Amino acid sequence: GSSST
Amino acid sequence: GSSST
Amino acid sequence: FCGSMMATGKLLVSYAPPGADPPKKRKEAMLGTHVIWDIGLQSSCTMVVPWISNTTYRQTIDDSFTEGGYISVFYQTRIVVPLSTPREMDILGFVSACNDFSVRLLRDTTHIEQKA
Amino acid sequence: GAQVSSQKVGAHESTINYTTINYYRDSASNAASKQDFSQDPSKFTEPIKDVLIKTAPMLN
Amino acid sequence: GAQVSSQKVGAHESTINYTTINYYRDSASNAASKQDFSQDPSKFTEPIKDVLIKTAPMLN
Amino acid sequence: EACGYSDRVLQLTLGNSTITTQEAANSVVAYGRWPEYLRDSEANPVDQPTEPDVAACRFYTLDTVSWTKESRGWWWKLPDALRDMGLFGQNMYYHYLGRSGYTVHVQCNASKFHQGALGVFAVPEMCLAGDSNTTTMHTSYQNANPGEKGGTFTGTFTPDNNQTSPARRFCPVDYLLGNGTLLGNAFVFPHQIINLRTNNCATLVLPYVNSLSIDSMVKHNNWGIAILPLAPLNFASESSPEIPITLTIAPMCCEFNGLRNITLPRLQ
Amino acid sequence: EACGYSDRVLQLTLGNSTITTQEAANSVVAYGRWPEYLRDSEANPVDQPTEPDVAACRFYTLDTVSWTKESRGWWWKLPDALRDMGLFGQNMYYHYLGRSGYTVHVQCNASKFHQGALGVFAVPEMCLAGDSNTTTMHTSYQNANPGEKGGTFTGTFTPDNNQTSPARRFCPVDYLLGNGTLLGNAFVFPHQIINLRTNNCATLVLPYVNSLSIDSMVKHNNWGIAILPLAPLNFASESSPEIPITLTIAPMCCEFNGLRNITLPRLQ
Amino acid sequence: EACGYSDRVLQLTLGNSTITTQEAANSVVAYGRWPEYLRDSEANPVDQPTEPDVAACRFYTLDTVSWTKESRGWWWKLPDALRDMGLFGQNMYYHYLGRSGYTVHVQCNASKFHQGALGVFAVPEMCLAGDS
Amino acid sequence: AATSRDALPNTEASGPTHSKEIPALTAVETGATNPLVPSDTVQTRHVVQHRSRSESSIESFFARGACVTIMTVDNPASTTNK
Amino acid sequence: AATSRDALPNTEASGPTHSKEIPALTAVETGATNPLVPSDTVQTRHVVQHRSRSESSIESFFARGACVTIMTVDNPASTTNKDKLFAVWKITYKDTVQLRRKLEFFTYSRFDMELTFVVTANFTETNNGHALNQVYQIMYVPPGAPVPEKWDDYTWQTSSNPSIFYTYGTAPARISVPYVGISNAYSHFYDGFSKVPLKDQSAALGDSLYGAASLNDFGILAVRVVNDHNPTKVTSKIRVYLKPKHIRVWCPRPPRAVAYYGPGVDYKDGTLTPLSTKDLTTY
């Protein structure tokens, strides 16, 4: 879906 | 939507 | 071994990793990885060439940097036969990969062409 | 309909993923996943009717 | 499979982000993240077996 | 075993080497003792030992000799026979002290139509008799130590009469086991027999045996391997049959103490 | 320490050998990595390694050279410099593969009235430049590998003009570190300086460094030891001072794979 | 087996026929797949099949050939080699379609004083090259 | 579940041997290949194997466009005879 | 967790000093560099430091395509006596100097390689003729695969070698390749030979180049114009650009200080004076 760094 | 392998 | 049942023998099968004089005498070959094969009911004998290399992969061409060493076979005792028996015969040899064996970098072969 | 899978990362700079969406109705139009399976060589290397135990005599 | 990270904003006009999706299976195909780590210079600048205290005599 | 395992079919693997045999007559472990490293409770030299492990504990094949109707027998000493074998021999000449056990595998095949029987004997401290009747205990170092070629037994004692320049070698008479005792009793030493109809090899696993925990390998031999024809070689109706005998020996659990510069012995 | 312990006074002990020093300038562990054996996770050749341990991991002293006002510098390669040293060299020529770390101890004492400074540099893959301007990469094996005598640096490039029979050796120019880069930067390599007023030795502990876990020791040198006078030798008002320089190197955590018959190289 | 069973001694029985052997080197099942009838899930022609069973699934011995020092080798095709064998061949020529697996038993004895080795190969789609 | 990119088996450490188990001896007449690994005939160390057969999977072996023909066409002047 | 774009340390304010702590005094013989900061030898103020080392991270230092070769091909009239030129290049970063000097600041490296191809063409004869848009085939022939002997022979089939068919005037071609070395890192320097000379063999037989490992390290690129011969001859160049992505480097080295002379570390007479005249007491 999404990974957030 | 999404499938994750 | 494809000689007769009456034929007996002990042979030495050798693998010498690279870097020294290629073995031409049993004296040398003995000192490397080897199997002393006793001929009998189990018709065949296997020597495993273990992966022993400096590089993590070798080239599929002749290359001194990635050379693999020397395979050889010698008489350990001698082939002995009784009378009424052939004094000469053949052995047949086979090669195959172990389960730890892999290849990479796909490429065209030199073993086929299409001139014109 | 997005398919998300992991890459096997060789040279490095967690898990890195990549995304795939099929744009066509026919499975033939799709790229290759390269998500393949290995199998045992037995059907070619050991095709004998009686199971071979390597420490034992092949002939008995 | 979208990766969202923050930009370090230099000249200004909250946090601004940017989005990354990997389109291929091989990690080699990927762009560079530039999300890199620094390390201490010690292995080159202080390679001595006994830890150096800078206020103390280097030789004692 | 109902899965096929036999007394007669063995595989031994030491280091990068393997021996297979399909006509063995079991194998012998001398005095029931498998080789072992020196225990702290029995230790003597205090320096850290070197244990070269697979580089020295592997099967070294010696020069093949030939068994004929006239053969009276052959002998070798250990560690002498191996003094020039790879990193074992090197470890031996670099150190004051060393100890080692051994797997001895004697090889001799023929056919169902040949016959004969070799007694293969492992003897601790195999002191052999000299060629002289003017001077006892005078076999020179060089002659006591043939290296891998070994020596031979004789059916006759011929005393060395050159008193000016004595041969200074052994004169090992076969029915006397080369040492003044009867061969028929050598079976009290660890042995096997290669009787051509039954088996084509002998295998003796030898422990380090000595009145000390470790000693000078260069000065002293711990074991002697003696091979004699108990029943003569014979084949079909041939008058001059010959079959080869090959020795392969592997050092086991060997360790060395007292490292210095290399020993360079006077061997000729 | 208030019990007396000093930076300057060290004792190193490997195998049956000990080095003492009373004028050290600490010691260096290259890239902060102490030598180590090859881990299973990084292993590559599958055969049982030989680890000779104390028989090879001990201090070998090389031939002493002499430092004078005209000295331009000296170099050695590892493992080449040690190829003939006891059981280490033997283990090296018997195996296809080998890896090793090293403690390098360079020795040079003088007096409170002498002066001068040696830069002692440990360089990974120390490729040196050839003597030719007609053929690149042509230094022969024999000349690339001096063994324990090492080689020397020169202040001048004299190109080999004998095209019939080329010298085929290095021509390592000193301010260019023998490799086309400026000496003033060689300090980015693991080093120490022997500055006669401060210390009388250099000590570098070197890990095995290579793009592989294990490799051909006979074909490839992992480290180069380069010693150059950063400040020239000088004493009292003498015009021809001389002080000796001695190298002592010990292999560490060394292991070998691919055992066969011994390599016998063409060295001259 | 400690009751005597050996790798080398086999008995195969199909239909009214039996083969015994005392010097076998085990036996091979090609690609690890034993022969099977066609499953409904893989079926294609819709008519009721004929399965002649023991009348066709039995050991047919072909003409014996002779191995000499000059022999270069021999070949046969299946089902061609069996086209004239009893009710199998009949079932073959009466029908548009047919499928079959096979047990192949090649026989060659000699003495402990003879020597030689035959490679016996089963090749799928063994297309051979022409003389032109 | 073993996949084409999985690492091949680790080499397991193995020591000296003296027994009735005979891995080296075999009989190719049976039609089988002896399933041996180095620890069967030499002494081995333990190695954690990383290599995989990913690029020799059937798909990977074939995953390339190959030229199969070169077709020739033209467009001539209308005046040509051909 | 300290990252390449983090701000460097703040300067801390420090005042006058009179003690036995001696930061300024040191001893370089030890092999270490004195870890000093300005507050050790002068009085400082407090500064909140914003600067970062983001652009000198190994990745950032290398994050650029560098030209490594210029390949020449043509497509002549069919009537020419001379053959149609196809090009063969041994892959290397050592045919040019700038990326080479940058990589050689280090001894070993690991990276994924990005190759980008710029293609330009021109007319050679003062003709007044034409050629139509060309298609180039850039074939990778890895060590062991058959090298093309002719612009049109069977090897350009490429059933297993990777090929790029580039169309003239389109965006420059680009591919990526993973870390493909047969070692655990690329070696920028190999102090060794690929052969041991044995005594028992002739000198010729045991000989090999100093510092060379595998003769054909990475194979070749072979480039051709796929179009058939044209009456007017056209000549093209394919410029190859190399960028090392996802890079790791080991063991730092002094940079090349005198001109490159071959693929090894060799130097040519007459090029060994990089430094210029400057007087000791002259600013």
Ligand SMILES: CCCCCCCCCCCCC/C=C\[C@H](O)[C@H](N)CO
């Ligand atoms: C369709 C085009 C495909 C092109 C593929 C090229 C793959 C070749 C890999 C080349 C890697 C070059 C790396 C640089 C050199 C090495 O670092 C050093 N000489 C030491 O190994």
Ligand SMILES: *C(=O)CCCCCCCCCCCCC
């Ligand atoms: C599953 O796919 C739901 C998520 C959709 C994300 C946007 C899809 C991107 C554009 C797809 C075009 C469709 C191709 C015919």
Ligand SMILES: *C(=O)CCCCCCCCCCCCC
């Ligand atoms: C994770 O990626 C789930 C969200 C997907 C958003 C749409 C992706 C945009 C198009 C991706 C094409 C895939 C590349 C092969």
